[PDB]
Amino acid sequence: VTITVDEYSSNPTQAFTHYNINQSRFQPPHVHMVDPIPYDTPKPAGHTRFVCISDTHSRTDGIQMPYGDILLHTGDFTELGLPSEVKKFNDWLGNLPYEYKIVIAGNHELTFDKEFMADLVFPSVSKLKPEDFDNVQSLLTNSIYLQDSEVTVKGFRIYGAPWTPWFNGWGFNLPRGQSLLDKWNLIPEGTDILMTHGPPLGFRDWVPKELQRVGCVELLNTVQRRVRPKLHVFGHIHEGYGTMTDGYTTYINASTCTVSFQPTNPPIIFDLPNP
Numbered sequence: 001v002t003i004t005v006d007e008y009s010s011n012p013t014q015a016f017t018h019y020n021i022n023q024s025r026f027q028p029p030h031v032h033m034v035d036p037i038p039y040d041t042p043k044p045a046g047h048t049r050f051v052c053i054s055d056t057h058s059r060t061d062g063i064q065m066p067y068g069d070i071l072l073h074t075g076d077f078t079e080l081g082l083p084s085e086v087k088k089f090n091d092w093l094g095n096l097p098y099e100y101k102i103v104i105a106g107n108h109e110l111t112f113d114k115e116f117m118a119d120l121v122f123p124s125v126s127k128l129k130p131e132d133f134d135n136v137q138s139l140l141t142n143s144i145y146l147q148d149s150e151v152t153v154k155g156f157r158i159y160g161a162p163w164t165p166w167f168n169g170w171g172f173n174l175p176r177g178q179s180l181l182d183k184w185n186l187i188p189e190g191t192d193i194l195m196t197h198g199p200p201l202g203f204r205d206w207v208p209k210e211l212q213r214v215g216c217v218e219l220l221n222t223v224q225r226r227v228r229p230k231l232h233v234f235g236h237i238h239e240g241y242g243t244m245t246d247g248y249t250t251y252i253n254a255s256t257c258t259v260s261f262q263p264t265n266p267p268i269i270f271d272l273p274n275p
């Protein structure tokens with residue numbers, strides 16, 4: 001399968017309406033919300049319990065973390081990517097019991113976006129000397145950090161990438177269309193769990209303030225038509241916290257912070273059978 005840039009790529013709200021009219025793409029019975037399960041739900045054998053969080057924004061003190069096996073964090077774990085914020089987050093991760101912790105960056109991780117930093121010439125971030133941030137990802141010693149890259153853990157193929165449709169030119173912002181498709185084309189076919197910082201079109205990507213869908217159309221087409229992972233986890237659009245399915249893939253918007261940056265959305269648990 002070859003994905004090409006969608007006719008409606010630049011206009012996600014119009015894309016949403018288009019595919020609903022022609023294909024019922026975002027409608028029942030196949031597309032619907034999936035209710036969360038409580039933390040005392042027994043995990044069946046030969047399954048892995050994924051604990052999904054995102055957009056913690058350095059507000060980790062006091063998050064109540066559930067029993068599980070593997071933590072997935074889909075980015076915006078800092079406010080500015082300051083090395084001290086990365087260290088604090090890593091310290092928090094080290095105290096969590098999970099066997100594996102998998103992390104991607106989001107748009108707030110400015111210091112991880114080397115093109116953003118190279119172009120810088122942002123009062124707090126501009127003060128940083130090259131030696132201050134040449135090792136930011138190495139500060140994440142208690143995690144497996146993914147960036148257009150993958151890991152196989154317990155047989156699960158997990159791929160992660162930070163890029164989102166351009167909003168304000170912060171970290172890992174790219175124009176809609178081919179620029180983003182070039183990144184999604186890197187996701188391998190047999191990926192089981194896809195982590196992106198932001199949503200695909202139509203799944204937990206509604207922004208009430210603008211009355212617009214903002215998910216990536218190229219990401220949606222990649223997920224549904226080419227890759228077909230069992231789980232696509234992301235955040236970015238804090239308001240979209242919650243879970244949907246399309247009948248095959250489960251989409252989890254794991255945003256821990258609300259749109260007002262309050263870390264009150266509970267971590268989402270999700271069980272998958274081991275490959």
Ligand SMILES: Nc1nc2c(ncn2[C@@H]2O[C@H](COP(=O)(O)O)[C@@H](O)[C@H]2O)c(=O)[nH]1
Pocket residue numbers: 055076107108165166167207210212214236237238239258259
């Ligand atoms: N309209 C619009 N709002 C966005 C976009 N990206 C992020 N936001 C808004 O900014 C909030 C915070 O995003 P963040 O700064 O943590 O990346 C989101 O919950 C959402 O309300 C976008 O592409 N378009």
Ligand SMILES: [Cl-]
Pocket residue numbers: 202203204205206240
């Ligand atoms: Cl939605």
Ligand SMILES: [Mn+2]
Pocket residue numbers: 035
């Ligand atoms: Mn219900």
Ligand SMILES: [Mn+2]
Pocket residue numbers: 055057076106236238
């Ligand atoms: Mn965020």
Ligand SMILES: [Mn+2]
Pocket residue numbers: 099
């Ligand atoms: Mn083991």
Ligand SMILES: [Mn+2]
Pocket residue numbers: 130131132133134135
């Ligand atoms: Mn250094």
Ligand SMILES: [Mn+2]
Pocket residue numbers: 189190191226227228229
């Ligand atoms: Mn596949």
Ligand SMILES: [Mn+2]
Pocket residue numbers: 157190191192
């Ligand atoms: Mn597979």
Ligand SMILES: [Mn+2]
Pocket residue numbers: 190191192275
């Ligand atoms: Mn598989």
Ligand SMILES: [Mn+2]
Pocket residue numbers: 076106107108197235236237
């Ligand atoms: Mn974000």
